[PDB]
Structures are given as structure tokens and as C-alpha cells.
Amino acid sequence: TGAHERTFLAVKPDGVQRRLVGEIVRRFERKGFKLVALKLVQASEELLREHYAELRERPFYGRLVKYMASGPVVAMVWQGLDVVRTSRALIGATNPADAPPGTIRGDFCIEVGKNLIHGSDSVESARREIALWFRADELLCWEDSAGHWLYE
Amino acid sequence: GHMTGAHERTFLAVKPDGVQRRLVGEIVRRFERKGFKLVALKLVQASEELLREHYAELRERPFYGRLVKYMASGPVVAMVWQGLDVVRTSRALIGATNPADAPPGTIRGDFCIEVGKNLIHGSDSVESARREIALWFRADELLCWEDSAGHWLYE
Amino acid sequence: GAHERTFLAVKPDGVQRRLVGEIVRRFERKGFKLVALKLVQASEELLREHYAELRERPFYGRLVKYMASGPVVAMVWQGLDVVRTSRALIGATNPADAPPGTIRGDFCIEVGKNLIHGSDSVESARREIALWFRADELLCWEDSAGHWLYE
Amino acid sequence: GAHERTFLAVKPDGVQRRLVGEIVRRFERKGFKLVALKLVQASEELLREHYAELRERPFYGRLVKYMASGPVVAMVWQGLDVVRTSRALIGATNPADAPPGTIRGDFCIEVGKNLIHGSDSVESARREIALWFRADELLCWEDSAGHWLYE
Amino acid sequence: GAHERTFLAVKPDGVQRRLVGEIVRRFERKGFKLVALKLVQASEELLREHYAELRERPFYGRLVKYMASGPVVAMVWQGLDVVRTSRALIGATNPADAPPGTIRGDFCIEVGKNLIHGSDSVESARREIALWFRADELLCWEDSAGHWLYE
Amino acid sequence: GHMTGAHERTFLAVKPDGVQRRLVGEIVRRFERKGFKLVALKLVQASEELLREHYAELRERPFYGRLVKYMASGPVVAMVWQGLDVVRTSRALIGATNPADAPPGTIRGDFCIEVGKNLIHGSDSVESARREIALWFRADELLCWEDSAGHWLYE
Ligand SMILES: Nc1ncnc2c1ncn2[C@@H]1O[C@H](COP(=O)(O)OP(=O)(O)O)[C@@H](O)[C@H]1O
Ligand SMILES: Nc1ncnc2c1ncn2[C@@H]1O[C@H](COP(=O)(O)OP(=O)(O)O)[C@@H](O)[C@H]1O
Ligand SMILES: Nc1ncnc2c1ncn2[C@@H]1O[C@H](COP(=O)(O)OP(=O)(O)O)[C@@H](O)[C@H]1O
Ligand SMILES: Nc1ncnc2c1ncn2[C@@H]1O[C@H](COP(=O)(O)OP(=O)(O)O)[C@@H](O)[C@H]1O
Ligand SMILES: Nc1ncnc2c1ncn2[C@@H]1O[C@H](COP(=O)(O)OP(=O)(O)O)[C@@H](O)[C@H]1O
Ligand SMILES: Nc1ncnc2c1ncn2[C@@H]1O[C@H](COP(=O)(O)OP(=O)(O)O)[C@@H](O)[C@H]1O
Structure with a gap:
């Protein structure tokens, strides 16, 4: 799908609490990506268990689920x-200690457990996460007036 | 409400020009830095139907048809802010309807030029806000959350 | 008049909300010279004196208690x-009346949590500077930018 | 009226204080179209004509000599x-009178060091644009954002 | 070596996306000295010469046509x-390879729409500056911040 | 420490060039936005004496006299940050000693050019930080306060 690739991103509860939603959105807008879905939600534990199913045998899995369910998150889909x-490069390493300055985690975070944002790790993961969090009628198609200046 | 006033809510929407011009984040950051609490948010393609109801007071103005067509022309970011x-x-932060009359420091004063591409809508009154919130959002989209910042914004 | 000085303080809410750098940057960008700075926890006794003119107001006790409750950033600016x-940059006491573009207009909602204190007059500034700082904390420096800020 | 143009210039103090980008960004973010730009040093002869309406004012000579003393960034903006x-964005002549949010309100202190010139009227802009720029320095370009700025 | 100079150009996509001021501010905040600036539309003849090292590359023709298609902001920076x-601040040619924090890493997606040109070497810079600018367009000014940037 | 590590402290100083170039707020804002806790701060005119001891380790370097003279050539903003x-x-956020080697996104990579005017000092090690904090600050200048933001920065 080339320039129509999509990823799932979510601002975690700490990003909402720390008033960094606009800052995060602005970084993806300024990069040139197209916002195609957006909502403030409170995710159920049932959803979050499915979301992080690959990590279910890790010792942190339970508390990760509980935390992500504990407050509002901003769910998003970006296209380009x-x-x-x-997006994963913009976000930075999982552990903010390894994320360089200039990345979101490098600039704003200290600890792995409070690392502001989730982004899909692969196109296959993105497909699964988008379907999990969004209905199809929440994913918008619009003609980007900037696209001539971002793409060949 | 009246208890303390702190649970008043307004409807704000980033119009299609704001999305196209990549100002969503800039607009959201201004309300975040002010201290208001985001309690609802969604990107939507608004139907002409909904928009006719939204702008019903402008039903017999000459621009009405172009406004509705235009607001339906692309995505809108619908929001509810509380405080x-x-x-x-929020009306003060946005500035005058005609950007030419909105002072620098306001959203319209800083970011736009013409009345028909003026980036954002905000409810003009508490009663308008009640009506608009109900029109654009379901009850279950309005979130109750515990704002860590409140202690530092409110006496 | 380029050596006039004011006393500004970031109140405990400004520290907690991580707005210290934002506030300092606004006075830097305007052209003023920072000549004193410290992070302190003010005593209630110091604050009672700082706000003595307000001692009969209903809110005086809670103002004092609040200003003493957490660190503040005390500053002196010159120009x-x-x-x-500085009072224009800060905005009206009640943020509802502070236009966008001002510190209180951009960042605050309520009169009791209004981020920053600034002296209200040159004589108030002299008094506040003396209350909060020793003479050896007030620095003199030659501003490389001054030729570009002043006629 | 979308093809109206104004002449703006970053004065020597704006260049020296490293505020050229900041100023340009304010006009870009507003939605105006940059149609001419150059870094130049103007002659006193050109400046005497630029400010000819102020020839009886006591500061006229000083103003001319100062504006000739260092590089300026000359610009034309359209919209x-x-x-x-543009005058509203710049703010009052005397920065003391310019509110925060304006260029002069955010960045300046004194009338003689007020960062930027903007034309005062459409007819003054026509005159100033002609004075500072050759016709071939004003560029026509198709504005990708025009549909989102204008109805 | 503080008098070294580079040629930078904001490409048509940077103008159209309203990133001129953002780009200039990054070089200003670094401490570099702007010594020439203009908005221009370059001829294919000039651009063929500019990019003559790339003449056997498959994209040469489309690169030349594109850079000739709309306005660019030509600049010379000193330091x-x-x-x-400057090349480090810009980032890798392909924005996919440019880290966050760089211009291309922050603002661009694709190699053909990569916002800005910067000279690749001192000798390329000398050649490019000569190609785009007349000698009288390069300004000598006394940099008020030089004592605080250099030893 | 070793309980959780969260009470580790570093000494940071904005050098005179950072004051003159009006980058104090910019610098402080980068540490605030990262989530660290400001526990001490003061503007000082550092004595040739204090500085000779600060830079004792560099006593045999040919630039040593010029470093001490420069660090006394205007105000310094002395800080202690915790986390x-x-x-x-903090060393990563500041970037390499030589700004020419500091990547964009770091303080030195974004804001300065030459090694002798490199804006800021940060402690290079925990032991250095212990020594620097002791040298520049009194114990009663290091403040214990309750950080509302810690709940959102730490698991
Ligand atoms: N060792 C850990 N301890 C606590 N939380 C962790 C740990 N490793 C990962 N996490 C959390 O789980 C999330 C998902 O992990 P993963 O998908 O591997 O990382 P990423 O979000 O960088 O793609 C991380 O973003 C982080 O919040
Ligand atoms: N004179 C006008 N010409 C064109 N569009 C207009 C005009 N007046 C208002 N509009 C459009 O209709 C919207 C609703 O108008 P109104 O409610 O009066 O303003 P506001 O949005 O400031 O509350 C405006 O925001 C603008 O988009
Ligand atoms: N009505 C009020 N209720 C609570 N606090 C108030 C009230 N009026 C003033 N204050 C507080 O007292 C501080 C000092 O008041 P004053 O000197 O009159 O205002 P300012 O700080 O704007 O100069 C204010 O900044 C504010 O924090
Ligand atoms: N009283 C004054 N003293 C010194 N310089 C002045 C004075 N009044 C105006 N100037 C300078 O002359 C310039 C041109 O004046 P004017 O056109 O009246 O103002 P503006 O630039 O706001 O349109 C001003 O921008 C300012 O630099
Ligand atoms: N494979 C490519 N396809 C299209 N354009 C390209 C390609 N490689 C390079 N370019 C364009 O050619 C310009 C000049 O190439 P080069 O000098 O090698 O890179 P740089 O601009 O990073 O110094 C690039 O900036 C880019 O716009
Ligand atoms: N080669 C040099 N020439 C001049 N000044 C230098 C040189 N190397 C270092 N300095 C200065 O001495 C300071 C201390 O050096 P060092 O401890 O090696 O770097 P850092 O501050 O990154 O820990 C530097 O920050 C810089 O101001």
C-alpha cells in the first residue's frame, strides 16, 4: 500500500495527564503524515489483554494491562x-534511556513503564491493532493538499 | 455547573482547514497549556444533515450553503473541554469570528486570515455548548477521569 | 532607566506544572537581564511580610499558606x-481578564493559581528585592545584546 | 483583495538578535504568501526617501543612519x-504599548529598537515595494494552501 | 576557520509547506551568521550546472525540472x-535515514521532497555560492554574538 | 541511590555564553520536559577560586586558565536535577563536549558551535556529581518537595 500504509498509535495515560497530546500530534503532523483516525477512549482490560497478547507470559503483562486501562488514552491512525x-523512529526505543534526544521518548520520558506512547511494530501488527481499536467508519479518507509536496 | 463551576464544558471543533494545514496539535496544545481538561475527542466526517442543525441559526444567511458544504468537505476534530x-x-483563546479582528495571541489571530476559513469553532454560550455537545457526541464518549493537574490549576 | 529592577517569583504551581523554563524564556526573549535567581522554600513569616498590604483580605491566610507550601523560583530582572x-507580560491578577499572549492568559484559569508574582511598582520592587535577596546575590553584567535593545 | 501586498523589513536589531526566522515563521503561520525576500544593506539615500514622511520629526536623521548601519531583511508578503x-501582528510603534502576542510586545522594549518595519497603508506599501525591489524580484507561485486559506 | 561559508537552499516544497522561517531559525539558534538571502526562481541552465556532479544519475532530469518549477530561498551561512x-542539521539525503532532531528527520518523508539543499564540501560551497549569488549580495556585518560563540 | 535509583542527582550549570545568548529558559525547559526534578537553582558570579577547584582535573590542559577566566566572565546558572x-x-541531552560532534536534538547540537563556548556543564559521573554538588551548593539549598509529576514519570 506504499503511501497508503497505516499505523496505530496511542498516547498512553501518562501522555494525557502530562498534557502532551498536542505536542505528540504536532510531531506527526509536522513530519507529513496524514491523520486518519482519532479518539479519546478508556480501554477495557479485555481489549488491552488482546492488544498485548504477544507479551502475555512476561512478568509485567498484568500491570501493563491494568495501567493502560486506568485512565484515558488517545487512539490514532496515521497514514503515509x-x-x-x-513512527517507531520518531517515538524512540522502548526504554527511554536508549532513545536519543529528538525522539519523543528521548525528549519527554525516563522509564520504560511510563513511556508516553504506543506505536505498532510492523505492518501486520498495525493491521491487527487498527482493527482492534477502531471501527471502519472511524477511519477517514481525505485528499491531502500537502501530498504533492511530500511525495513524488 | 454551580457547585464550583469547574465542570462546565464547551464544544470545540477543528474545521477542515485546520486539519489540512496541520494545526490540530497546535490547537490542542493551546487548550492543554491553559489547563482545561479534555473529556472527549474524535475525528469525524460530518454529514450535511448534522451541520444544518449545528448552523441552524445561520439558516437564512447568504453563506449558509457554502459553509455546510465546506464543513462537510473534509475531516473535523470534534472535542469537549472542561473547566x-x-x-x-475558549472563545477568548480562539478570538473574533473574523480573523482580521482577532488579536495576535489568539488562535485565529495567529493562524488564519479569512472569516470563511477560520480554523475552529467554539460554543458561544453555555446553552449552545449543551446543545452542541449533545448533537456531536454520545454520552458514553464524554469521559470521567481524575486530573492530576487540577490541584495546581484550582484553588 | 535601563538599570530599573523588578522582583518576580514563579509560584509553587509554576514549578509543579514545569513552566519555569517557559516563564524565564519569555523575559529573556523580551530583552530583560536576569540579575538574580534562586529556588527557595519561603517561610510563612517572609510571605506575611511580602503580602503585608493584603493582611486584612479574606484570602491572605490561604495565599500565605499556599505560597509557603512548595518551592518558588525567586528572580530579579533588570531593564x-x-x-x-513585566506586569503586562504576566497579565491581570484574575486570569479570566488576562488576554491570550500573557503568561496568565496562556497558562492559568483561577486567581488563586496564577503562576507568578511581579512587583506592582518601583517602590514595591525595591522592598521585595531587599526582602528576598542579599546584596551579593544581585549580579552586574555587561549585556552583549544591549546595543540592540536600547537606543 | 487576496493579491494585496505589503513591504516588511527586519531591522538591524532583528538580524543581530537572530530573530529573522522567528519573524518569518509568524507570517507563514498566519497564512500569508512570501513573494520577495532579500538580505541587503540600504543606502542613506534610499532610506531618506523610504522615511520621507518623517523628515520633520526630530529622530529622522538618527533613524536613517541606524537603518543604513547594518543588514536588513527586506520582504514582500501577499494576502x-x-x-x-501585518501591522497588527507587529504591534504598536512603541513596544511599551504593544501587547504580548505581537512581535514588538514579545521581543522589544524601546521605540528605536523595534525589530521590524511594516508598511502603514496599501499606497505606502506600493511605494515601498517599488523603492526596495526590482520588478523581477517579486515572484508568482501557485499556493498549495490557497484553497484552505480563502473561500 | 570561522569565516567558512556554505550555500543552503530551501527547495520548493519547503516554501510551499511554509517552513522557511522554521529552517532559518534552526541555523540562527545554532549561532551561524546569515550573510546572503534571496527568494528566487532558478533557471534550468543554472540548475544543470548546480547539479552537474549528478548528471549521469537517473533522477538528474527530474531533479533539475523540479528545482526550476517554483521558488526557492537561497542562502549563505557563515561560521x-x-x-x-549544516549537513548534520539537515540530515541524510533520504529522510527515512535521517534521525529525529534533523530537519529532514523532523519534517520529511521521501528523497524527492527533502526540503533543503546544503553544500557537501567547502569547495562545492565556494562553487555554489558563486553560481547563485553576486559578490555584492554577500554582506559583511559585525556579529554582536561572536564573542559568545567563539574563543 | 540503590533503592530505586530515582534520587540520583547531577550538577548542571549554564555557562556565561548561555546567559548572554538568552538560552537559560530553553535549557531549563528541556530538563523540565524530560521529567527530572529541579532541586536546587541559583545565579552566581563564580569566583576564580571555586572554578579552579571545579576544573582541578583539567589543570594540566593548555586551555585551563582560559576556561577559568571565561567561567568568571559573566553569570552562571547553577542547578541540581534529580531522577x-x-x-x-543529562550528558546525553547536552551532547558531546565538542558541539561539532553533538547530534541535532541535543542542547549543544542545536545551540552552539565551538568547544570553548559550549553553553552548559553536566557532571560526567555519579562521583563527580557528588563532588560538584557539594562544591557549588549548601545542603540547605537542596530542596525536598513533593513532585506531582512523579506519578506519571515512574512506574
Ligand atoms: N521490562 C519492562 N518493564 C515494564 N514495562 C515494559 C518492559 N518492557 C516493555 N514494557 C512496556 O510494554 C510496552 C510494549 O512493549 P514493546 O512492544 O516490546 O515496546 P514498544 O512500545 O517500544 O514497541 C512498552 O512500550 C512498555 O511500556
Ligand atoms: N461574513 C461571513 N462570511 C463568511 N463566513 C462567515 C461569515 N460570518 C460567519 N461565517 C462563518 O460561519 C461561522 C459561524 O459564524 P458565527 O457563529 O457568527 O462565528 P463564530 O464561529 O466566531 O462563533 C464562522 O466561524 C465562519 O466560519
Ligand atoms: N480574590 C482572590 N482570591 C484569592 N487569591 C487572590 C485574590 N485576589 C488576589 N489573590 C492572590 O493574591 C496575589 C497578590 O494579589 P495582587 O498583588 O492584588 O495581584 P497581582 O499578583 O496581580 O499583582 C495574586 O497574585 C493572587 O495570587
Ligand atoms: N519617537 C521616536 N523615537 C525614535 N524612533 C522613533 C520614534 N517614533 C518612531 N520611531 C521609529 O521610526 C519608525 C517609523 O515610524 P512610524 O512609521 O511612525 O511607526 P511604525 O514603524 O510602527 O509604522 C518606527 O518604527 C521607529 O523605529
Ligand atoms: N534516488 C533519488 N531519487 C530522487 N531524488 C534523489 C535521489 N537521490 C538524490 N535525490 C535528490 O538529489 C538531491 C541531491 O543529491 P545529493 O547531493 O546526493 O544529496 P544531499 O542533498 O543530501 O547532499 C537530494 O537532496 C535529493 O533531493
Ligand atoms: N579542546 C578544548 N579547547 C577548549 N576548551 C575545551 C576543550 N576541551 C574542553 N574544553 C572546555 O572544557 C570543558 C570541560 O571539558 P570536558 O570535561 O572534557 O567536557 P564536558 O564539559 O563535555 O564534560 C568543556 O565543556 C569546554 O568548555
Whole structure:
């Protein structure tokens, strides 16, 4: 899908509490990606168990689920060329200690457990996460007036 | 309400020009830095139907058809913000309807030029806010959460 | 008049909300010279004196208690008309009346949590500077930018 | 009226204080179209004509000599009501009178060091644009954002 | 080496996306000295010469046509190691390879729409500056901040 | 420490060039936004004496006299910041000693050019931080306060 690739991103409860939602959104807007879905939600533990199913045998899994369910999150879908991989570069390493300055985690976070944002790790993960969090009628198609200036 | 006033809510929407011009984050950050509490948020493609109801007071103005068509022309970011005097204060942060009359420091004063592409809507009154919130959101979309910042914004 | 000085303090809410740097940057960008700075926990006794003119007001006790409740950033800034200009940058006491573009207009909601204190007059500034700082904390420096800020 | 143009110039103090980008960004973020730009040093002869309406004012000589003393960034911006709106963005002549949120309100202290010039009227802009720029320095370009700025 | 100079150009996509001021501010905040600036539309003849090292590359033709298609902001910046450092601030040619914090890493997606050109070497810079600018367009000014940037 | 590590402290100082160039607020804002806790702060005119001891280790370097003279050539903003891995992290945020080697996104990478005017000092190690904090601050200048934000920065 090339420039139509999509990723799932979510601002975690700490990002909402720390008033960093606009800052995060602005970084993806300024990069050139197209916002195609957005909502403030409180995720159920049932949903979050499915979301993090790959991690279910890790010792932190339970508290990760409980935490992500504990307050509002901002769920998003962004669209563009290589948006999955590039979003992960913008976000930075899982452990903010390893995330360089200039990344979101590098600039704003200290600890792995309070690392502001989730982004899909692969196109296949993105497909699964988008379907989990969003209905199809929440995913918008619009003609981007900037696209001529971002793409060949 | 009247208890303390702090649970007043307004409807704000980033119009299609705000999305196209990549100002969503900038607009949200201004309300975040002010101290208001985001209690609802969604990106939507608004139907002409809903918009006719939203702008019903402008039903017999000459621009009405172009406004509705335009607001339906692309995504809108619909929001509800909560806090003391949020309706009046949000109108001040946005600035005058005609950007030419909105001072620098306001959203319209800083970011736009013409009345027909003026980035954002905010409820003009508490009663308008009640009506607009109900029109645009379901009850279950309005979130109750515990704002760690409140202690530092409110006496 | 370029050596006029004012006393500004970031109140405990400004520290807690991580707005210290934002506030300092606004006075830097305006052209004023920072000549004193410290993070302190003010005593209630100091604060009772600082706000003595308000001692008969219903809110005086809670103002004092609050200002003593957490760290504040005490500052002295220097430049032409700095006292009045700083008050303009800060905005009205009640943030509801502070326009966008001002510190209180951009960042605050309520009169009791209004981020920052600034002296209200040159004589108030002299008094407040003396209350909060020793003479050896007030620095003198030659501003490389001054030729570009003053005629 | 969307093709109205104004002449703006970053004065020597704006260049020296490293505020050129900040100023340009304010006009870009507003939605105006940059149609001419150059870093130049103007002659006193050009400046005497630029400010010819102020020839009887006691500061005229000083103003001319100062504006000739260092580089300035000359610009033309295009858009609806650009002259009047640009003046609003810049703020009052005397920065003491310019509210926070304006360029002069945010960055300046004194009337002689007030960062930027903007034309005062459509007819003054026509005159100033002609004075500072060759016709071939004003560029026509198709504005991708035009549909989202204008109805 | 503090008098080294580089040629930078904001490409048509940077103008259209309203990123001129953002880009300039990044070089200003670094401490580099702006010594020439203009908004221009370059000829294919000039651009063929500009990019002559790339003449056997498959994209050469489309690169030349594109850079000729709309306005660019041509600039010269001065300072110690300005060529190499500017390239670092810009980031990798392909924005997919440019880290966050760089211009291309922060603002761009694709190699053909990568916002800005910067000279690749001191000798390339000398050639490019000569190609785009007349000698009288390069300004000598006394930098008020130089004592605080350099030893 | 070793309980959780969250009470580690570093000494940071904005050098005179950072004061003159009006980057104090910019610098402080980068540490605030990262989540570290400001526990001490003062503007000082550092004596040639204090500085000779600060930079004792560099006594045999040919630039030593010029470093001490420069660090006394205007005000310095002395700070103590607290948090998990604050010494190592602060060094990463500042970037390499030589700004030409500091990547964009770091303080030195974004804001300065030459090694002799490199804006800021941060402790290079936990032991150095212990020594620097002791040298520049009195114990009663290091404040214990309840950080509302810690709940959102720490698990
Ligand atoms: N060792 C850990 N302890 C606590 N939380 C962790 C740990 N490792 C990962 N996590 C949390 O689980 C989330 C999902 O892990 P993972 O998908 O591997 O990382 P990423 O979010 O960088 O793609 C992380 O973002 C983080 O919040
Ligand atoms: N004279 C006008 N010409 C064109 N569009 C207008 C005009 N007046 C209002 N509008 C449009 O209709 C919207 C609703 O108008 P109104 O409620 O009066 O303003 P506001 O949005 O400031 O509350 C405006 O925000 C603008 O988009
Ligand atoms: N009505 C009030 N209720 C609570 N606190 C108040 C009230 N009026 C003033 N204050 C507090 O007292 C501080 C000092 O008041 P004053 O000197 O009159 O205002 P300012 O700080 O704007 O100069 C204010 O900044 C505010 O924090
Ligand atoms: N009283 C004054 N003293 C010194 N310089 C002045 C004075 N009044 C105006 N100037 C300078 O002359 C410039 C041109 O004046 P004017 O056109 O009246 O103001 P503006 O630039 O706001 O349109 C001003 O921008 C300012 O630099
Ligand atoms: N494979 C490519 N496809 C399209 N355009 C390209 C490609 N490689 C390079 N370019 C364009 O050519 C310009 C000049 O290339 P080069 O000098 O090698 O890179 P840089 O601009 O990073 O110094 C690039 O900035 C880019 O816009
Ligand atoms: N080669 C040099 N020439 C001049 N000044 C230098 C040189 N190396 C270091 N300095 C200065 O001495 C300070 C201390 O050096 P060092 O401890 O090696 O760096 P850092 O401050 O990054 O820990 C530097 O921050 C810089 O101001």
C-alpha cells in the first residue's frame, strides 16, 4: 500500500495527564503524515489483554494491562509512506534511556513503564491493532493538499 | 455547573482547514497549556444533515450553503473541554469570528486570515455548548477521569 | 532607566506544572537581564511580610499558606520599565481578564493559581528585592545584546 | 483583495538578535504568501526617501543612519488585508504599548529598537515595494494552501 | 576557520509547506551568521550546472525540472565548520535515514521532497555560492554574538 | 541511590555564553520536559577560586586558565536535577563536549558551535556529581518537595 500504509498509535495515560497530546500530534503532523483516525477512549482490560497478547507470559503483562486501562488514552491512525517504521523512529526505543534526544521518548520520558506512547511494530501488527481499536467508519479518507509536496 | 463551576464544558471543533494545514496539535496544545481538561475527542466526517442543525441559526444567511458544504468537505476534530468558565475562556483563546479582528495571541489571530476559513469553532454560550455537545457526541464518549493537574490549576 | 529592577517569583504551581523554563524564556526573549535567581522554600513569616498590604483580605491566610507550601523560583530582572512591562507580560491578577499572549492568559484559569508574582511598582520592587535577596546575590553584567535593545 | 501586498523589513536589531526566522515563521503561520525576500544593506539615500514622511520629526536623521548601519531583511508578503493585519501582528510603534502576542510586545522594549518595519497603508506599501525591489524580484507561485486559506 | 561559508537552499516544497522561517531559525539558534538571502526562481541552465556532479544519475532530469518549477530561498551561512555542521542539521539525503532532531528527520518523508539543499564540501560551497549569488549580495556585518560563540 | 535509583542527582550549570545568548529558559525547559526534578537553582558570579577547584582535573590542559577566566566572565546558572539515571541522561541531552560532534536534538547540537563556548556543564559521573554538588551548593539549598509529576514519570 506504499503511501497508503497505516499505523496505530496511542498516547498512553501518562501522555494525557502530562498534557502532551498536542505536542505528540504536532510531531506527526509536522513530519507529513496524514491523520486518519482519532479518539479519546478508556480501554477495557479485555481489549488491552488482546492488544498485548504477544507479551502475555512476561512478568509485567498484568500491570501493563491494568495501567493502560486506568485512565484515558488517545487512539490514532496515521497514514503515509513507511509510516509504521518511521513512527517507531520518531517515538524512540522502548526504554527511554536508549532513545536519543529528538525522539519523543528521548525528549519527554525516563522509564520504560511510563513511556508516553504506543506505536505498532510492523505492518501486520498495525493491521491487527487498527482493527482492534477502531471501527471502519472511524477511519477517514481525505485528499491531502500537502501530498504533492511530500511525495513524488 | 454551580457547585464550583469547574465542570462546565464547551464544544470545540477543528474545521477542515485546520486539519489540512496541520494545526490540530497546535490547537490542542493551546487548550492543554491553559489547563482545561479534555473529556472527549474524535475525528469525524460530518454529514450535511448534522451541520444544518449545528448552523441552524445561520439558516437564512447568504453563506449558509457554502459553509455546510465546506464543513462537510473534509475531516473535523470534534472535542469537549472542561473547566471553570471554559465556554467564555475558549472563545477568548480562539478570538473574533473574523480573523482580521482577532488579536495576535489568539488562535485565529495567529493562524488564519479569512472569516470563511477560520480554523475552529467554539460554543458561544453555555446553552449552545449543551446543545452542541449533545448533537456531536454520545454520552458514553464524554469521559470521567481524575486530573492530576487540577490541584495546581484550582484553588 | 535601563538599570530599573523588578522582583518576580514563579509560584509553587509554576514549578509543579514545569513552566519555569517557559516563564524565564519569555523575559529573556523580551530583552530583560536576569540579575538574580534562586529556588527557595519561603517561610510563612517572609510571605506575611511580602503580602503585608493584603493582611486584612479574606484570602491572605490561604495565599500565605499556599505560597509557603512548595518551592518558588525567586528572580530579579533588570531593564527599562521592567516593573510595568513585566506586569503586562504576566497579565491581570484574575486570569479570566488576562488576554491570550500573557503568561496568565496562556497558562492559568483561577486567581488563586496564577503562576507568578511581579512587583506592582518601583517602590514595591525595591522592598521585595531587599526582602528576598542579599546584596551579593544581585549580579552586574555587561549585556552583549544591549546595543540592540536600547537606543 | 487576496493579491494585496505589503513591504516588511527586519531591522538591524532583528538580524543581530537572530530573530529573522522567528519573524518569518509568524507570517507563514498566519497564512500569508512570501513573494520577495532579500538580505541587503540600504543606502542613506534610499532610506531618506523610504522615511520621507518623517523628515520633520526630530529622530529622522538618527533613524536613517541606524537603518543604513547594518543588514536588513527586506520582504514582500501577499494576502487579504495583509497591510493592516501585518501591522497588527507587529504591534504598536512603541513596544511599551504593544501587547504580548505581537512581535514588538514579545521581543522589544524601546521605540528605536523595534525589530521590524511594516508598511502603514496599501499606497505606502506600493511605494515601498517599488523603492526596495526590482520588478523581477517579486515572484508568482501557485499556493498549495490557497484553497484552505480563502473561500 | 570561522569565516567558512556554505550555500543552503530551501527547495520548493519547503516554501510551499511554509517552513522557511522554521529552517532559518534552526541555523540562527545554532549561532551561524546569515550573510546572503534571496527568494528566487532558478533557471534550468543554472540548475544543470548546480547539479552537474549528478548528471549521469537517473533522477538528474527530474531533479533539475523540479528545482526550476517554483521558488526557492537561497542562502549563505557563515561560521566554523558550517558546511559539515549544516549537513548534520539537515540530515541524510533520504529522510527515512535521517534521525529525529534533523530537519529532514523532523519534517520529511521521501528523497524527492527533502526540503533543503546544503553544500557537501567547502569547495562545492565556494562553487555554489558563486553560481547563485553576486559578490555584492554577500554582506559583511559585525556579529554582536561572536564573542559568545567563539574563543 | 540503590533503592530505586530515582534520587540520583547531577550538577548542571549554564555557562556565561548561555546567559548572554538568552538560552537559560530553553535549557531549563528541556530538563523540565524530560521529567527530572529541579532541586536546587541559583545565579552566581563564580569566583576564580571555586572554578579552579571545579576544573582541578583539567589543570594540566593548555586551555585551563582560559576556561577559568571565561567561567568568571559573566553569570552562571547553577542547578541540581534529580531522577533515575539523571547523570548519564543529562550528558546525553547536552551532547558531546565538542558541539561539532553533538547530534541535532541535543542542547549543544542545536545551540552552539565551538568547544570553548559550549553553553552548559553536566557532571560526567555519579562521583563527580557528588563532588560538584557539594562544591557549588549548601545542603540547605537542596530542596525536598513533593513532585506531582512523579506519578506519571515512574512506574
Ligand atoms: N521490562 C519492562 N518493564 C515494564 N514495562 C515494559 C518492559 N518492557 C516493555 N514494557 C512496556 O510494554 C510496552 C510494549 O512493549 P514493546 O512492544 O516490546 O515496546 P514498544 O512500545 O517500544 O514497541 C512498552 O512500550 C512498555 O511500556
Ligand atoms: N461574513 C461571513 N462570511 C463568511 N463566513 C462567515 C461569515 N460570518 C460567519 N461565517 C462563518 O460561519 C461561522 C459561524 O459564524 P458565527 O457563529 O457568527 O462565528 P463564530 O464561529 O466566531 O462563533 C464562522 O466561524 C465562519 O466560519
Ligand atoms: N480574590 C482572590 N482570591 C484569592 N487569591 C487572590 C485574590 N485576589 C488576589 N489573590 C492572590 O493574591 C496575589 C497578590 O494579589 P495582587 O498583588 O492584588 O495581584 P497581582 O499578583 O496581580 O499583582 C495574586 O497574585 C493572587 O495570587
Ligand atoms: N519617537 C521616536 N523615537 C525614535 N524612533 C522613533 C520614534 N517614533 C518612531 N520611531 C521609529 O521610526 C519608525 C517609523 O515610524 P512610524 O512609521 O511612525 O511607526 P511604525 O514603524 O510602527 O509604522 C518606527 O518604527 C521607529 O523605529
Ligand atoms: N534516488 C533519488 N531519487 C530522487 N531524488 C534523489 C535521489 N537521490 C538524490 N535525490 C535528490 O538529489 C538531491 C541531491 O543529491 P545529493 O547531493 O546526493 O544529496 P544531499 O542533498 O543530501 O547532499 C537530494 O537532496 C535529493 O533531493
Ligand atoms: N579542546 C578544548 N579547547 C577548549 N576548551 C575545551 C576543550 N576541551 C574542553 N574544553 C572546555 O572544557 C570543558 C570541560 O571539558 P570536558 O570535561 O572534557 O567536557 P564536558 O564539559 O563535555 O564534560 C568543556 O565543556 C569546554 O568548555
